[PDB]
Amino acid sequence: EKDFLPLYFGWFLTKKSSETLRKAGQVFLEELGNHKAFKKELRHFEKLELVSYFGKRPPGVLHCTTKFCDYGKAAGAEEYAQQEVVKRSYGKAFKLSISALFVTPKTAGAQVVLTDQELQLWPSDLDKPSASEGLPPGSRAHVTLGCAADVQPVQTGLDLLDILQQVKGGSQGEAVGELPRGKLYSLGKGRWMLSLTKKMEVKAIFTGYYG
C-alpha cells in the first residue's frame, strides 16, 4: 500500500481574500469588456461579456497551485510532497502578492509575485518552467480567475509566461487606458494586462487538495 497524495498542492485563499479577489477579477472583466480599446480590438474580430467568455471558473476557493500531483500519478509528485519545506509549510498561512490581472483569448487570471520564502515551495520540475523561457523562477505563479470552454489545465500559467515575455522585451508599450485599479496594457493578440496601482495582498493557507 502506498500513501496516495493530493490532487495538487497550493496556497488556498481564505474565504475573505478569495471573495475579495474574485470580485476584483469580475469587476476587471466587466470593466475591460466595456473599455473602448478592448471593444475596438474585439470588433476587429459588438459587445462581449468577458465573465461569460471565461465561464469555467474555480468552483471552490481561489488558489495558487504549486505542484499538481494527481494523487501521485503526476511526475515528480512524491518527490515534491516529501520535501522538508513542504511538510514544514503545510497548514501555514502566507500572504500572496498580486501585481496584475490579465486576460488572453484563453484565460483570465491574477499574476502572483512570490517571496523568496514562498518560492521555496515552488516546484523544481514544471514541464514548461520560467527558465525555459528566459524568465526568473516562479514567474508562472498565478491565481486562475476563469477559462474559455475548451481551455485545459495549466494554460493560465503558460499564458502568464507569454505575457511576461511581452513586458520583458518591452512590448508593453504605453498604457492604452486606465481602470480604477490601475493602468491597462494591450499586448496584442487578445492579450491584456491591468497593472495594479496598488498590489493586492491575499491571505492563503498552504496545503493539499484531494478533490
Ligand SMILES: Nc1ncnc2c1ncn2[C@@H]1O[C@H](CO)[C@@H](O)[C@H]1OP(=O)(O)S
Ligand atoms: N499538468 C497539470 N495538470 C492539471 N492541473 C495542473 C497541471 N499543472 C498545474 N495544474 C494546476 O492544478 C490545478 C488543478 O488542475 C489548477 O490550478 C491547475 O492550474 P490552473 O492554471 O489553475 S488551470
Ligand SMILES: [Cl-]
Ligand atoms: Cl516557473
